[PDB]
Design a protein around this nucleic acid. Sequence first.
RNA 1: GGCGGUCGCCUCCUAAAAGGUAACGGAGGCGCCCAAAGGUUCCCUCAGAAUGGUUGGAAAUCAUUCGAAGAGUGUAAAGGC
RNA 2: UGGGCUACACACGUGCUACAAUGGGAAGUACAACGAGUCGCUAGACCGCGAGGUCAUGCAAAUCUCUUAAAGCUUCUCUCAGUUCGGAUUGCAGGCUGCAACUCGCCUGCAUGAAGCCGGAAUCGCUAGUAAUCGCGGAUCAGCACGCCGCGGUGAAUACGUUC
Lengths: 82, 114, 177, 80
Amino acid sequence: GRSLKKGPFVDDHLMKKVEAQQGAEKKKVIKTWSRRSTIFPSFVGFTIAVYDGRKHVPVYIQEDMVGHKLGEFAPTRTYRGH
Amino acid sequence: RIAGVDIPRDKRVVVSLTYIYGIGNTTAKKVLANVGVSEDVRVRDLTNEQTDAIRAEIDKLKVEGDLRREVNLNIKRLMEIGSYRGIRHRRGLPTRGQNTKNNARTRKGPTKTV
Amino acid sequence: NRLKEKYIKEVTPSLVEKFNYSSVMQTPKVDKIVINMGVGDAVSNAKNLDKAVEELALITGQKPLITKAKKSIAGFRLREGMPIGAKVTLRGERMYEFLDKLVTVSLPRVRDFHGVSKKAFDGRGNYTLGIKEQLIFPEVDYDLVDKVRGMDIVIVTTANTDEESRELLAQLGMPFQ
Amino acid sequence: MKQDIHPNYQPVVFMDSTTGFKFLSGSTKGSSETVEWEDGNTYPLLRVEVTSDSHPFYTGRQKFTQADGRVDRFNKKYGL
RNA sequence: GGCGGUCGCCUCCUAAAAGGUAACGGAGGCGCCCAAAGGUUCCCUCAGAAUGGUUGGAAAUCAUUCGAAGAGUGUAAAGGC
RNA sequence: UGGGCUACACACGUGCUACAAUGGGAAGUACAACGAGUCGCUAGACCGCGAGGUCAUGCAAAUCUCUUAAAGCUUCUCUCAGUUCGGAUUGCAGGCUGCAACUCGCCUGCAUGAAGCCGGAAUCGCUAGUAAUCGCGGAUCAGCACGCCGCGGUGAAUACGUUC
Ligand SMILES: [K+]
Ligand SMILES: [K+]
Ligand SMILES: [K+]
Ligand SMILES: [K+]
Ligand SMILES: [K+]
Ligand SMILES: [K+]
Ligand SMILES: [K+]
Ligand SMILES: [K+]
Ligand SMILES: [Mg+2]
Ligand SMILES: [Mg+2]
Ligand SMILES: [Mg+2]
Ligand SMILES: [Mg+2]
Ligand SMILES: [Mg+2]
Ligand SMILES: [Mg+2]
Ligand SMILES: [Mg+2]
Ligand SMILES: [Mg+2]
Ligand SMILES: [Mg+2]
């Protein structure tokens, strides 16, 4: 995976939006197109609406999701069976 | 016998240990080198001192039921958080990016020509 | 006799104090233990029951009584009088010896053992324990077994209520959840 | 107790091989090892890997790390 | 009259609280079975339900409690146990 | 900008790897050719189980490097077993390239260890340095092929004949 030296990756525009809200009694949804961004522990408690190609899917970030990309929780293809 | 598994008595120790879930070829060599048991002796020839040394060595590692619960918990987590991988696990499809238009028979099971 | 020794010396004085028993005869005691193996597979092959009975004897040390179907059922392919099921009744010393091994030897060998149920009381102070698989008992030899089978262990006590039976069983040794 | 219908059953001593704990009981099992017991008697000796005095549930003392929280796993891998 | 049905035996209702009592009145059985499903001696008590319990499911075996008969009595019904 | 072209109850084409002992594993030892290279090919040393990393060296090159080729040969081992065969799948941990590898990358370690016991009707290639088998280089290319193009190593069987 991504080299340990490089550290974990998150887009600064997304990281800024979460940082602006950390000290918030009531959080609000963060609309993002950054599927590539890693879920940091600071994301826990937020709902990040992730673009899946056509819409923003609201994903609630539980502490069990840390380390996974935001895109892992916004499937791009719809398949209900043949 | 060693970790609750009757390892093959006729085989050499390096291989007999591999019949333990969580011990592969490389791990078997490591535990024998630590205990000091020659790799070529059939386990039928292992003395109680050698067997107990192996059991002591193996007890350090995570094997058998302990390993199986550990891995199943990992998959359980992927499903619970609703990740893409978890859905792949739950729907019986390849989880590591493999194409499914063809092949994927290991995950899917036998062909349903219908 | 170790568990019986524990019961008469340690358990009895404590239970009298906890429940304020005016006379010692009120103290609940284990009346009997009945191990039952419901073997419906005897229909498909009679020897599965035969091998089941052999293992049941080694676990308890008593030749089991082969129970028979009292009623015919077509769904189970069962005919009245067919020998399906075996049970053993342990009383006195043989009961205490078995209960000791169950508490101290058998239960720890249960795969991923997190204790025995705590709601498994009939409401009258009798506890029944469902053993999922054999090979927890040291007598089974782990290789003779062809089909892994379990058993219903019914501990019958003279306690009038679940609470007293729960306490009695706990102090006698019981890994309740 | 009827004669010649029951399996052979004798007093025996189980040993916890993880700690050497032993107690007196009866069993139908046999072994090639015997030990002396207090009160001046000898009984066959049966080897048990785990007993109630060495099982994690009964003792309560575990031997693993109880897994690693993913938030803790994340912070450890990167020192945050 | 024909067609169909019936033809001997057992149980019930009809049958009017003794018995008997008819109709091409209303319902069912029989032409056996059992070597114990007979005799006797000794012993035993059911069906279901609730609750708990590995495989095990509405329901197969196990335990307790409740349960006067709601079972069973080879074979119809009545009477009986 | 993100997604898709990589979606998967299924059917077919072309491949790759196998189903083992004419083999698998370990150790030791030998022999090519075509090619490519400047911010590229990288010696040597050191660190790491490894993928690789680090300092650093030569070479715009029949001078230096990629590049000590693999089959092979010689010993040891395994002993017919769904196995010490097979390496799919999955868990975990890493390495690289890249602004980024969740959808969609390649590689590494540990663990896991699927089908497969030589394949129905049918069908394909090949007449010798050929088939078979073994590696090696290159184009595209940050990274990424079991494909394609080329290269050498080892190296057979058979053709009576022209009815179909
Ligand atoms: K895919
Ligand atoms: K295909
Ligand atoms: K291919
Ligand atoms: K093919
Ligand atoms: K060899
Ligand atoms: K990718
Ligand atoms: K083939
Ligand atoms: K390339
Ligand atoms: Mg193994
Ligand atoms: Mg792919
Ligand atoms: Mg009258
Ligand atoms: Mg009358
Ligand atoms: Mg009678
Ligand atoms: Mg395409
Ligand atoms: Mg074979
Ligand atoms: Mg030609
Ligand atoms: Mg060639």
